């Protein structure tokens, strides 16, 4: 039966190369070095990055730190197409209650966006517009409150997840895994969710064993993972929240403000 | 194989520990739930009048609410007693930096006592006084705000928990694994905890893999509960933080207090 975990394994990893432009093993290269991105580290080179090279999610439509937490959200919902399109291709994913898809959706593509941004993170700072761009851990711990603190658990989390050194192969699995979580309020035909879910839980076991056999335990330290994965997202809300009931320079054009 | 036996020896080990550790089993909540003796039968307590009859048929302020929040806090503590001691024999630990065991402890104590009031529990309520007695879920949510829905998260979890029908047997490898969390914050030495963990999630994949052999991914199902017990234990600290506001003249327990105190 091994021979249908791995064929769903490779079919995830497939159609995970199809739907995300920016993978982990292109991020690391660029990361590391092996090419070059323009960095951003201060209010000068911001500038020059937005002119020059023109991030489209800092484009015209203000405050820095203002314009910065914008471009994340902006970047985000773009994410999200990315991710549902994903979603389409696990097996048996479609046949769902139409209303569940949305649910799990709704649900889950915070934790996949975190997980896969780590993918985009070292300890140093993040690859942005499809990694053209580098900015600094620091340049975004130096934003005003309360924006100085809105990266930052993004990359403390993303340096403990990263040093599972898990490759593209392995993540479309665990995303696949994440996407089909039994658990999201609201759901209204549980079981064949966490049916598909199983069966790609026992695809990510068998990948971490074959791809990872040195790794001992690799499986149950990434499932440990969801807990600092929602957390990160839980903590996300409450700042959203902070940001929205305090903060007045926020607002954008109405439908803009729709979009996103 | 040489492996699979060491594994083995260790799962037996905690077990062992466990029913030396903790007076009341899950195998003994359920026979006492389950109402199918005649010996085991507990006394309900469901309203007022049950309640102030339980104070005489069974062996343990003028006040009401507070009295069931105190009595809580007693056995707690009590838990935390057991559960103490139950982290001293699981191998390695007491080897650990002295700074660590407090760590690891402090973290873990209150996910173990959800964990464990769990296999005390039914959807309609849970056994207390070491099962001779039996509160329904409907009278504790009857309390006055804020202590009216203490327990009702509770009682969530434990439904959904109790569903993947463990035993003590696995419950045993599982606590430990709890114990012997590398990411807790501020420990000292990583590595020797993560590598004691790392052995104990061996004997728990193994355990559940001959003990429920039937029940696909059970080992990665357990895992992902313990992101519920992780958000169980921040919510009641912050109702903890709402009662020590509106009932400045309720005494909280010091132990309890230096465990949650910056957790
Ligand atoms: C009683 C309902 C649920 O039980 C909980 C619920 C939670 C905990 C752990 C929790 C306790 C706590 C309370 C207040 C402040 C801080 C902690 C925790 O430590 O987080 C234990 C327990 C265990 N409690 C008991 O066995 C228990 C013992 C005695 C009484 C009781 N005694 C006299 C009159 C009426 N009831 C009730 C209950």
Do not use: V, Y
């Given at each position: 039966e091994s021979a249908d975990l791995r064929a769903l394994a490779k079919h995830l990893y497939d159609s995970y190369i199809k739907s995300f432009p920016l993978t982990k093993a292109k991020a690391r290269a660029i990361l590391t070095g092996k090419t070059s991105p323009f960095v951003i580290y201060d209010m000068n080179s911001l500038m020059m990055g937005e002119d020059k090279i023109k991030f489209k999610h800092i484009t015209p439509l203000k405050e820095v730190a203002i314009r910065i937490f914008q471009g994340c959200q902006f970047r985000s919902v773009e994410a999200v197409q990315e991710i549902t399109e994903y979603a389409?291709?696990?097996?048996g994913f479609v046949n769902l209650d139409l209303n569940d898809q949305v649910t799990l959706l709704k649900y889950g593509v915070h934790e996949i966006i975190y997980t896969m941004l780590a993918s985009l993170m070292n300890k140093d700072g993040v690859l942005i517009s499809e990694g053209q761009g580098f900015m600094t851990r620091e340049f975004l711990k130096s934003?005003?409150?309360?924006?100085?603190?809105?990266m930052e658990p993004k990359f403390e989390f993303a340096v403990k997840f990263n040093?599972?050194?898990?490759?593209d192969s392995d993540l479309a699995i665990f995303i696949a895994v994440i996407i089909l979580?039994?658990?999201?309020?609201?759901?209204?035909?549980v079981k064949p969710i966490e049916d598909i879910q199983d069966n790609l839980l026992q695809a990510l076991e068998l990948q971490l064993k074959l791809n990872?056999?040195?790794?001992?335990?690799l499986f149950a330290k990434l499932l440990q993972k969801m807990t600092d994965l929602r957390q990160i997202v839980t903590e996300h809300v409450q700042l959203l929240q902070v940001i929205k009931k305090?903060?007045?320079?926020?607002?954008?054009?109405p439908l803009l403000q729709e979009i996103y």
């Open positions: 389409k291709s696990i097996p934003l005003r409150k309360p924006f100085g603190d809105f040093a599972l050194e898990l490759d979580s039994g658990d999201r309020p609201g759901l209204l035909n990872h056999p040195e790794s001992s335990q305090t903060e007045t320079d926020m607002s954008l054009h």
